[PDB]
Amino acid sequence: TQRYYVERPIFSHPVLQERLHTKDKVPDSIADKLKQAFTCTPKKIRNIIYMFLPITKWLPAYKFKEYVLGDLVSGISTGVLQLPQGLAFAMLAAVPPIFGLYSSFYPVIMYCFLGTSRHISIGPFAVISLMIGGVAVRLVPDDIVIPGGVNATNGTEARDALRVKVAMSVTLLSGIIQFCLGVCRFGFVAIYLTEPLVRGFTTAAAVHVFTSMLKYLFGVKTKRYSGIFSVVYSTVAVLQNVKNLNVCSLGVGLMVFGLLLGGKEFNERFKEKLPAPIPLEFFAVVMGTGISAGFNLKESYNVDVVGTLPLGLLPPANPDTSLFHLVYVDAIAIAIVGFSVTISMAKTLANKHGYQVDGNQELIALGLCNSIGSLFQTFSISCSLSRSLVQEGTGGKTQLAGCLASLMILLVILATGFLFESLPQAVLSAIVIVNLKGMFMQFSDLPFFWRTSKIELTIWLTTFVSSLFLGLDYGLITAVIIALLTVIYRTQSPSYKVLGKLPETDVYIDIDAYEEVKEIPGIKIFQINAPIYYANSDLYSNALKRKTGVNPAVIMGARRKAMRKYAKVKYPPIVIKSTFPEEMQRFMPPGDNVHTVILDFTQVNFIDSVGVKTLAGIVKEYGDVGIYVYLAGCSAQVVNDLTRNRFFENPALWELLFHSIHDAVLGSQLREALAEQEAS
Amino acid sequence: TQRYYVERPIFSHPVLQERLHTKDKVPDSIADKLKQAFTCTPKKIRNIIYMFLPITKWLPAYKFKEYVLGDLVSGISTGVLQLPQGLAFAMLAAVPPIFGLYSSFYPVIMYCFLGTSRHISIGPFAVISLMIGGVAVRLVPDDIVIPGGVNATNGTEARDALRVKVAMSVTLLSGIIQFCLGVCRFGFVAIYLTEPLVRGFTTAAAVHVFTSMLKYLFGVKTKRYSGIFSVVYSTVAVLQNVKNLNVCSLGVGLMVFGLLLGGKEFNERFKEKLPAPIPLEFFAVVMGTGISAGFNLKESYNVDVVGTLPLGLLPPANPDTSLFHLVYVDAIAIAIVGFSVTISMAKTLANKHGYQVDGNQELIALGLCNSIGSLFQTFSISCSLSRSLVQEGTGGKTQLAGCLASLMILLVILATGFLFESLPQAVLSAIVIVNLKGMFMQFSDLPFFWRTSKIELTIWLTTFVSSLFLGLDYGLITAVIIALLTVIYRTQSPSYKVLGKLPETDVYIDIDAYEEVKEIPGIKIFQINAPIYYANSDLYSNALKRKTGVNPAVIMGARRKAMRKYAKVKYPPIVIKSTFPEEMQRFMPPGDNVHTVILDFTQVNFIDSVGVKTLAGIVKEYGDVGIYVYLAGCSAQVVNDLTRNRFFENPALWELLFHSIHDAVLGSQLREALAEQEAS
Ligand SMILES: CC(C)CCC[C@@H](C)[C@H]1CC[C@H]2[C@@H]3CC=C4C[C@@H](O)CC[C@]4(C)[C@H]3CC[C@]12C
Ligand SMILES: CC(C)CCC[C@@H](C)[C@H]1CC[C@H]2[C@@H]3CC=C4C[C@@H](O)CC[C@]4(C)[C@H]3CC[C@]12C
Ligand SMILES: CCCCCCCCCCCCCC
Ligand SMILES: CCCCCCCCCCCCCC
Ligand SMILES: CCCCCCCCCCCCCC
Ligand SMILES: CCCCCCCCCCCCCC
Ligand SMILES: CCCCCCCCCCCC
Ligand SMILES: CCCCCCCCCCCC
Ligand SMILES: CCCCCCCCCCCC
Ligand SMILES: CCCCCCCCCCCC
Ligand SMILES: CCCCCCCCCCCC
Ligand SMILES: CCCCCCCCCCCC
Ligand SMILES: CCCCCCCCCCCC
Ligand SMILES: CCCCCCCCCCCC
Ligand SMILES: CCCCCCCCCCCC
Ligand SMILES: CCCCCCCCCCCC
Ligand SMILES: CCCCCCCCCC
Ligand SMILES: CCCCCCCCCC
Ligand SMILES: CCCCCCCCCC
Ligand SMILES: CCCCCCCCCC
Ligand SMILES: CCCCCCCCCC
Ligand SMILES: CCCCCCCCCC
Ligand SMILES: CCCCCCCCCC
Ligand SMILES: CCCCCCCCCC
Ligand SMILES: CCCCCCCCCC
Ligand SMILES: CCCCCCCCCC
Ligand SMILES: CCCCCCCCCC
Ligand SMILES: CCCCCCCCCC
Ligand SMILES: CCCCCCCCCC
Ligand SMILES: CCCCCCCCCC
Ligand SMILES: CCCCCCCCCC
Ligand SMILES: CCCCCCCCCC
Ligand SMILES: CCCCCCCCCC
Ligand SMILES: CCCCCCCCCC
Ligand SMILES: CCCCCCCCCC
Ligand SMILES: CCCCCCCCCC
Ligand SMILES: CCCCCCCC
Ligand SMILES: CCCCCCCC
Ligand SMILES: CCCCCCCC
Ligand SMILES: CCCCCCCC
Ligand SMILES: CCCCCCCC
Ligand SMILES: CCCCCCCC
Ligand SMILES: CCCCCCCC
Ligand SMILES: CCCCCCCC
Ligand SMILES: CCCCCCCC
Ligand SMILES: CCCCCCCC
Ligand SMILES: CCCCCCCC
Ligand SMILES: CCCCCCCC
Ligand SMILES: CCCCCCCC
Ligand SMILES: CCCCCCCC
Ligand SMILES: CCCCCCCC
Ligand SMILES: CCCCCCCC
Ligand SMILES: CCCCCCCC
Ligand SMILES: CCCCCCCC
Ligand SMILES: CCCCCCCC
Ligand SMILES: CCCCCCCC
Ligand SMILES: CCCCCCCC
Ligand SMILES: CCCCCCCC
Ligand SMILES: CCCCCCC
Ligand SMILES: CCCCCCC
Ligand SMILES: CCCCCCC
Ligand SMILES: CCCCCCC
Ligand SMILES: [Cl-]
Ligand SMILES: [Cl-]
């Protein structure tokens, strides 16, 4: 083993700069940069095609023998849950359920082509459907007058058609906004969604989904709520109207709930003994529809059912732009939340499988899916969190599982929709609530983040609370801003350390940590692991004066107290010799006799005008009491900040900068040695 | 001159920790901390008295011979401007002007006792008066029905009294809120008001004051505006109604404006030849009142005048709490803005004279002033920015200048108010607009901050725009949040450097800077001057792979390409030996042959779970291609972050941590030397 041997002079800033000569920057012209960016080599255009059409990349590279079984199983398990989820979220959107079935088919196919993530389940989302239903009922209220040429016994088909038109218009506008954001490179903001923020946001979204499904489980009538505290208002309304519950609907829902939970526990416990998990949502749907049809619960017990499901696909229809001015604000929120849910969950799965998802391409895919689907009577889509978990955890590898689920949905649409006409809505709510269990399991992060990092636990809890009580649109931006402000908190509460020297080395460590580190007599070394910016400068100065025990104000006060008791352009030097008489020095209270204060700037990232002013004040105040202040380890960037401000207006301050702590200590000791040599 | 000599072994983390033994933390119990905090020594209670009653400190220490002349001159110059400003801002508040005169007397006296700043002019502020007038006219509209027992020719005395009652109620509530905030240590938030933010905010406030004075200068009638874009609405309304201007009012205002500007230029240019600046506002008031009375402009030309000013002070009257529920929201905003203007300007002056102001005591003083003054028919106060500049720049030393100005205001109130009854409001507006020149001079900061720091120039401009177009309440919080986010931007755009070694030393400097620094063959040293938190980790990884030119993905791709072309708990090792055949190695494109990558962590302040995951991924990916990754200069705090996360789940990673760059380089070279020794 070799050894660490260094033999060189003390490197103050002028001494080190005497060795260093400026290098010539290589020419980097912007025009040539653009010209070389517009070369258009075939590899570049192939990469562009892959970036905009990801299916052109992962589909030719499809490992059939390794992927087909997992994709098939995941697709079946995803579709059996996608059908009832589609119907339920169509009910949430104040549109007929067949439109939810449509929204479960086209967008998934288009996202298989345009999407980067290979584990998320594209489809209707409860919160997005709630926003769509809110805007649709605002524009088309229940008490609207429609001269449709019908008798007094109106079947509300015209109202449903008008609400469908409103939903398509808002979906098209949200898709256009999302596509424009994706083109404008907005997806970079996805870097601000940290893992605790994403997980708290998704858990709050799951709680929102659970709240939105309560009225259909109980069979009660409830006002639509959307906005701040919408979850609280909805829960309060449900618990208020629970006295008018439908006992038959609640019984069927709870029965499906219990069997679904039992089956899920059976699947999880016997996972190793089962070739593929049993698709339980399909069994629940079939069993609930059979019980509802056999006992005729629709009118004998007034149990709400799905209703008629027309067969066949609809031709493309141009949405009316004339409603844009009435929905644009809403179309903005749906544009954000729909992205926020999609890019969060994708990340949650991407980090689970060691790949990365392009936020810009996610925005482009979402926008194109929404805008094109609005032509096919599709309302706004997102990522279904619980269904994404089901798809990922069932062995899903690519998005071909989404295509298989869409094919099952298309089978329902084209041929077998009429079988699900008598299916109660309580069964759908029970299915959704049961499948929210995997998302509710994310509450185990609280002990985890408690043990790992309490700041990120705070981020988790703040995101959860803000996205729960406020909306997922205002709550998300609140959480993002607070998570960013956690960095400000970190800089505002740094580790102020007083350093001591490990003997016979150049290693300087916190004096109160190891106890072989010994403080150098007459020298104080103070270290902050933070920048010295404006929100930090005063705290840094106070901590420097407190921890080191060298307060210039206290020193001046003691000198004046002894003065009271004993009685019975061309610049001046920075450090003023203490002209205190020895007879009056007999009145000094005993002290550490510190002649130099070393400020460790190795971990100081930057310093602004306020920090520079504080530093200059510190230097001047310590020089007024005859104490030298040295800066050790100032980076070239921090030196540039000190130079851009007028810190080095006096060139003498240049000799206060040293390369390292050991350089500063040696320079101070040499300064003292020369001073005592010249003294006598 | 001595030399830097170091001779020691290579300090990897285990090697250095073998020398270091844990120290015993001194016992610091919270109960004993509270017990020693409740000692109540006479010095402690004296300090408490000084902190809560600052006049008990600076008044006994009043240097009479050095301060009296400056205080007298500053007080006279402050009062001559305080009178018309008080009348004008009373007009802004929809209250009779005598109430502005009252608001110019009691709060200044109380702030002389309770205030920490010794240069700001306490009094009515245009924006606070605008908020008070807005709430007063909202609660008491111009078309209100008052059964006051009067004829059809109502003189609007009852409406004025009701508006005064509303103003007192909102003032009392705002004062209570401010006092409660000051007690609760809210003033700490004053640390978040950096100098560019403060100066931009104050310049925007000056523009607000200029906008609010236009209608009285032109003599036009304008709707009251308060809220977002209130300045734009007010300016648009004034320029719309300017066709109905009062030519006499505009002429008198512009004449006073021109003489005031000429006199101010005369005072500034001949400052050295004048013992004291001429008080020009008093001359303007006297001259305008004399012209208005002599030519009888009140009804001959329908020129708006100040109106009657009753003489004598009013007895204390209890404000009606019954209006609190109607004004509380407004009382919150006035509580914030009034503090925000006061603590900003104070800081602006404090930094100018080398002292500090306690934000908590500023809040307490403002709250007590407002709450007690509301008993004396005083509406909410703040710091007058232009008058504060006048007081500071005229030689003001203590707050006794404020007391002299208050004594002049009291002289006007008690005996000579009736002389100012015929004074036109155009003269008051002209005086205010002329005196806003010193505040408008702050626009010179734009070239200054352009040269010093463009980030803080951005802070200046953002604060100005936000506080201008939005209110001073929403604009201020917007500016504070954006100024805080500038730190996030700084961390998100750090200096990614590739380091090279200065020969015969241990100094490692950016390779592209000095050109005597030479890169060590086979070793890459990468440095970031930022933390590696979540919003930074992916950028840091990309920059590491790009700047160093060592991309593990590209290396694996090239190895597989050569494979194609040539054909025609117990853990595994971190770094996998590259089992590439020499015959296939003949297919390697030439490369740098880098065996070790050194990551400089000296300037990395902290690392969270996301950063730790990125770092572990970097280590694993580089070890998969047979490249070692070393961490150099990891602080004890960063080591604690890596340990709290499961980074050191494999103990072998402990040997990847070195004390410094030179230690890591020597360790890598020794590792290679031992490898070649054992090879053959
Ligand atoms: C200061 C940092 C730490 C947090 C900032 C949070 C901000 C962005 C949050 C806090 C609460 C939020 C408000 C809560 C409610 C509403 C009402 C709604 O109809 C429009 C949005 C609006 C007005 C929100 C705007 C954004 C908001 C002001
Ligand atoms: C960089 C940005 C995101 C930092 C945070 C700025 C936040 C705190 C600002 C920016 C825009 C602001 C909003 C702008 C306008 C209004 C309408 C007004 O009637 C109530 C306040 C409210 C709702 C503001 C609340 C605060 C607000 C949301
Ligand atoms: C043990 C001292 C640190 C404790 C940190 C706990 C963080 C809790 C954050 C709660 C945030 C709630 C937002 C409404
Ligand atoms: C080990 C973590 C020590 C700190 C625990 C408490 C963290 C509190 C973070 C508060 C951040 C507030 C940002 C607005
Ligand atoms: C020369 C490249 C840096 C230029 C920085 C200029 C900053 C201007 C900020 C403007 C903010 C306006 C907010 C509406
Ligand atoms: C010399 C300064 C280099 C950077 C100039 C441009 C600074 C732009 C700051 C933008 C901050 C945005 C925070 C929301
Ligand atoms: C950047 C998001 C908005 C893109 C512009 C959309 C404008 C709507 C299209 C015109 C409708 C009349
Ligand atoms: C509203 C549009 C915002 C666009 C923001 C683009 C930011 C791109 C930064 C790229 C950094 C690598
Ligand atoms: C990806 C396929 C897009 C096809 C869009 C066709 C739109 C036709 C609209 C006809 C309106 C009458
Ligand atoms: C987010 C940018 C605005 C989104 C597009 C709004 C289009 C409004 C059209 C209004 C027509 C009167
Ligand atoms: C992002 C491109 C979306 C294209 C979908 C159709 C846009 C136009 C709608 C019909 C206008 C008449
Ligand atoms: C913290 C600021 C609010 C302090 C509480 C004020 C409550 C008003 C007093 C009671 C009025 C009826
Ligand atoms: C609304 C009340 C907020 C109180 C915040 C007090 C913060 C004090 C921090 C003290 C750090 C030295
Ligand atoms: C600092 C002096 C405060 C005096 C407050 C007296 C309040 C008297 C109110 C009488 C109401 C009738
Ligand atoms: C900032 C905390 C609230 C300020 C005090 C509000 C008092 C409201 C009283 C309402 C009475 C009905
Ligand atoms: C902060 C203390 C202010 C005291 C001023 C009077 C508060 C009570 C107002 C009258 C209530 C009847
Ligand atoms: C309106 C903003 C359009 C996009 C500006 C450039 C963003 C960064 C591109 C790399
Ligand atoms: C705690 C939920 C809100 C109140 C629900 C009960 C209201 C009365 C129901 C009879
Ligand atoms: C007698 C039971 C009739 C059930 C008809 C609907 C069956 C649903 C299968 C999906
Ligand atoms: C993605 C394939 C879309 C096919 C739409 C067919 C519509 C037929 C309407 C009669
Ligand atoms: C995999 C099944 C795809 C859907 C088939 C639908 C048949 C419709 C027959 C009318
Ligand atoms: C609302 C239901 C919350 C249930 C939390 C379950 C956490 C289990 C961690 C193992
Ligand atoms: C709001 C309910 C929170 C429940 C947290 C339970 C965490 C259990 C982790 C094992
Ligand atoms: C070890 C237990 C940690 C518990 C942290 C979660 C606290 C939840 C408070 C709402
Ligand atoms: C991650 C960016 C989140 C932006 C939220 C914006 C909310 C707008 C609500 C209308
Ligand atoms: C709005 C109140 C913000 C308080 C921040 C406290 C930070 C303390 C750091 C020492
Ligand atoms: C409501 C907050 C009351 C004050 C909490 C303690 C603030 C820090 C005191 C030093
Ligand atoms: C640009 C200011 C707003 C328009 C002012 C002029 C309106 C017409 C005045 C006759
Ligand atoms: C003839 C002029 C009368 C002027 C009376 C008011 C004088 C104002 C002096 C402050
Ligand atoms: C600060 C001194 C306050 C004196 C108030 C006197 C009021 C008298 C009313 C008749
Ligand atoms: C310095 C002048 C103080 C105010 C004197 C007021 C005299 C009033 C006489 C009735
Ligand atoms: C609105 C008037 C702005 C005038 C700016 C003057 C700046 C002078 C710098 C010397
Ligand atoms: C909005 C007007 C801005 C004027 C800036 C002028 C700066 C001059 C500095 C010498
Ligand atoms: C040297 C000139 C610097 C000018 C910076 C101010 C720009 C103002 C843009 C609104
Ligand atoms: C420096 C703290 C500024 C806080 C602004 C709050 C605005 C509230 C408006 C009602
Ligand atoms: C709301 C858009 C925020 C964009 C921030 C851009 C920061 C760029 C740092 C590289
Ligand atoms: C190179 C083929 C890319 C995928 C085309 C679409 C296949 C369904
Ligand atoms: C290399 C295979 C290209 C075609 C993929 C399958 C298209 C349906
Ligand atoms: C190598 C190409 C495999 C394609 C598999 C397609 C499965 C539908
Ligand atoms: C490795 C894939 C083999 C099967 C190719 C697809 C056959 C249908
Ligand atoms: C989710 C698709 C199920 C289709 C079942 C059709 C036969 C009942
Ligand atoms: C790097 C591409 C930027 C594109 C900006 C938006 C172009 C319309
Ligand atoms: C209220 C219904 C009782 C019978 C069904 C019970 C299912 C748990
Ligand atoms: C082992 C799971 C039993 C499920 C019983 C019903 C749950 C609601
Ligand atoms: C799921 C089968 C239910 C059968 C009910 C039959 C009632 C006539
Ligand atoms: C009104 C409740 C909002 C909750 C936000 C929590 C942020 C700490
Ligand atoms: C942790 C720092 C938060 C500061 C927010 C701004 C308060 C005015
Ligand atoms: C020790 C005296 C403090 C000031 C008392 C008030 C003087 C007007
Ligand atoms: C030391 C002087 C105390 C009194 C100051 C003046 C009080 C009016
Ligand atoms: C040393 C005490 C001086 C007091 C001066 C008071 C001026 C009014
Ligand atoms: C140094 C102050 C001398 C004057 C004291 C006050 C005399 C009125
Ligand atoms: C600002 C106070 C002036 C008082 C003047 C009284 C004589 C005109
Ligand atoms: C350090 C004092 C804190 C006071 C908190 C508020 C007490 C009511
Ligand atoms: C129209 C004659 C004006 C006389 C007074 C002068 C004020 C400018
Ligand atoms: C030297 C200042 C002359 C002032 C003329 C009038 C300014 C509006
Ligand atoms: C400022 C003196 C004005 C005098 C005007 C006299 C008109 C009768
Ligand atoms: C609507 C104008 C707001 C201006 C805010 C500026 C912040 C960069
Ligand atoms: C979603 C954007 C949050 C603000 C980030 C600003 C960083 C400079
Ligand atoms: C019963 C009260 C509900 C509050 C919101 C819970 C999500
Ligand atoms: C739980 C459903 C069973 C149907 C018969 C209920 C009486
Ligand atoms: C004439 C338009 C005025 C816009 C606001 C200026 C302050
Ligand atoms: C000439 C403008 C001032 C009006 C004075 C009228 C006597
Ligand atoms: Cl969902
Ligand atoms: Cl002002």
Tokens 């950016």 belong to which residue?
Answer: B510
Q: How far lies B679's CA from each of A61, B625, B674, B675, in Å?
A: 40, 19, 8, 6
Q: How far apart are the C-alpha atoms of A579 and A581, rounded to whole Å?
A: 6
Q: How far apart are the C-alpha atoms of A563 and A582, rounded to whole Å?
A: 12
Best probe residue, ligand 29, of B283, B286, B289 (max atoms within 8 Å of C-beta): B289
A447-475: burial string, b at 16+ Cβ within 10 Å, e else:
eebeebbebbbbbbbbbbebbbbbbbbbb
Q: Are B547 and B498 in contact (CB under 8 A)?
A: yes
Q: Are B604 and B610 in contact (CB under 8 A)?
A: no
Q: How far apart are the C-alpha atoms of A428 and A418, rounded to whole Å?
A: 16
Say if residue B386 carries a ligand binding annotation: yes
Query: Ligand 39 centroid to A69 CA: how many Å?
Result: 12
Taking residue A301's Cβ as centre, other Cβ atoms within 10 Å add up to 17
For A254, the 3-state DSSP assignment is helix
- Name the residue among B343, B383, B360, B339 with its Cα closest to residue B198: B343
Please count the residues of chain A: 680
- Name the residue among A458, A389, A423 with its Cα closest to residue A216: A423
Q: How far lies A591's CA from each of A549, A554, A619, B226, in Å?
A: 9, 12, 20, 60
Q: Taking CB atoms and an 8 Å limit, are A2 and B673 in contact across chains?
A: yes
**Residue to substitute from A459, A482, A507, interface B, most B β-carbons within 10 A:** A507
Token couple for A17:
């700069």
B374, exposed or middle or buried, with CB in 10 Å at 0-12, 13-18, 19+?
buried
| Nearest chain A Cα distance for residue B365, angstroms | 23
Handedness of CA B35, B38, B44, B48 (dihedral sign): positive
**Structural domains of chain A ordered from first start:** 63-143+155-489 (no CATH), 495-679 (3.30.750.24)
A660: nearest CA partner in chain B = B507
Taking residue A150's Cβ as centre, other Cβ atoms within 10 Å add up to 12
Ordered alpha helix ranges (H), B244-309: 247-269, 280-295, 297-300
Q: Are B426 and B164 in contact (CB under 8 A)?
A: no
Angle between the N-to-C axes of helices A636-644 and A609-624, in degrees from 0 to 180, rounded to the nearest 10: 80
- Name the residue among A215, A224, A128, A125 with its Cα closest to residue A429: A215
Neighbouring residues of A248: CB distance < 8 A, sequence distance ≥ 6: A219, A297, A301, A302, A303
**Nearest-5° Cα angle at B611, B608 to B617:** 140
Q: Taking CB atoms and an 8 Å limit, are A608 and B456 in contact across chains?
A: yes
Q: How far apart are the C-alpha atoms of A428 and A425, rounded to whole Å?
A: 5
Query: Ligand 18 centroid to A234 CA: how many Å?
Result: 12
Residue nearest to atom 9 of ligand 19 (CA): A286
Q: How far lies B407's CA from each of A224, B320, B414, in Å?
A: 63, 29, 10
H or E, element range at A9: strand A3-9
Q: How far lies A265's CA from each of A73, A277, A385, A434, B492, in Å?
A: 18, 11, 20, 11, 45
Q: What are the CB-based long-range contacts (under 8 Å, 24+) for A353-360?
A: A353/A119, A355/A118, A357/A116, A357/A117, A358/A51, A358/A116, A358/A187, A359/A186, A359/A187, A359/A188, A359/A189, A359/A190, A359/A191, A360/A182, A360/A183, A360/A185, A360/A186, A360/A187, A360/A188
Q: In the PDB record, what is the listed experimental method?
A: cryo-EM
Taking residue B585's Cβ as centre, other Cβ atoms within 10 Å add up to 12
The region that residue B311 occupies, defined by phi over 0 for left and psi between -120 and 50 for alpha, beta otherwise, is: beta
| Nearest chain B Cα distance for residue A8, angstroms | 5
Angle between the N-to-C axes of helices A609-624 and A534-547, in degrees from 0 to 180, rounded to the nearest 10: 20
Q: Taking CB atoms and an 8 Å limit, are A487 and B490 in contact across chains?
A: no
B7: nearest CA partner in chain A = A5
Query: Ligand 11 centroid to A371 CA: how many Å?
Result: 7
Ordered alpha helix ranges (H), B115-156: 126-139
DSSP state of A670: H
Q: Are A655 and A630 in contact (CB under 8 A)?
A: no
Q: How far apart are the C-alpha atoms of B76 and A182, rounded to whole Å?
A: 63
Task: Tell me the CB-side half-sphere exposure of residue A63, using CA atoms within 13 A.
Answer: 4
Nearest CB to A6 within list B6, B491, B516: B6
Handedness of CA B31, B37, B41, B42 (dihedral sign): negative
- Name the residue among B254, B252, B243 with its Cα closest to residue B296: B252
Neighbouring residues of B328: CB distance < 8 A, sequence distance ≥ 6: B173
**Nearest-5° Cα angle at B27, B26 to B31:** 150
Cα dihedral value B318, B322, B328, B332, nearest 10 = 10
Beta strand A628-632 with A657-658 is parallel
Q: Are A595 and A523 in contact (CB under 8 A)?
A: yes
Q: Are B195 and A609 in contact (CB under 8 A)?
A: yes
Nearest CB to A487 within list B1, B491, B495: B491
Q: How far apart are the C-alpha atoms of B679 and B673, rounded to whole Å?
A: 10
Cα dihedral value B344, B348, B349, B353, nearest 10 = 140
Per-position DSSP letters for A408-458, written without gaps between them: HHHHIIIIIGGGGTT-BHHHHHHHHHHHTHHHHGGGGHHHHHHHH-HHHHH
For B189, the 3-state DSSP assignment is helix
- Compute φ and ψ for A382, nearest 5 degrees: -160, -165
Angle between the N-to-C axes of helices A126-139 and A195-212, in degrees from 0 to 180, rounded to the nearest 10: 50
Neighbouring residues of B44: CB distance < 8 A, sequence distance ≥ 6: none
Query: Ligand 52 centroid to B411 CA: how many Å?
Result: 7
Token couple for A307:
């209703």
Q: Are A463 and A196 in contact (CB under 8 A)?
A: yes
Q: Taking CB atoms and an 8 Å limit, are A194 and B669 in contact across chains?
A: no
Taking residue A590's Cβ as centre, other Cβ atoms within 10 Å add up to 5
Q: Taking CB atoms and an 8 Å limit, are B516 and A613 in contact across chains?
A: no
Nearest CB to B603 within list A515, A635, A666: A635
Q: How far apart are the C-alpha atoms of A114 and A55, rounded to whole Å?
A: 7
Q: How far apart are the C-alpha atoms of B310 and A448, rounded to whole Å?
A: 71
- Name the residue among A559, A558, A525 with its Cα closest to residue A544: A525
Q: Are A234 and A212 in contact (CB under 8 A)?
A: yes
Q: What are the CB-based long-range contacts (under 8 Å, 24+) for A465-468?
A: A465/A204, A466/A204, A467/A200, A467/A201, A467/A204, A467/A205, A468/A204, A468/A207, A468/A208, A468/A231
- Name the residue among A8, A6, A18, A20 with its Cα closest to residue A655: A18
- Name the residue among A360, A364, A344, A363 with its Cα closest to residue A352: A344
Q: State CA A191 to chain mean position distance.
A: 7
Ordered alpha helix ranges (H), B25-125: 30-37, 42-52, 55-58, 64-92, 97-103, 106-114
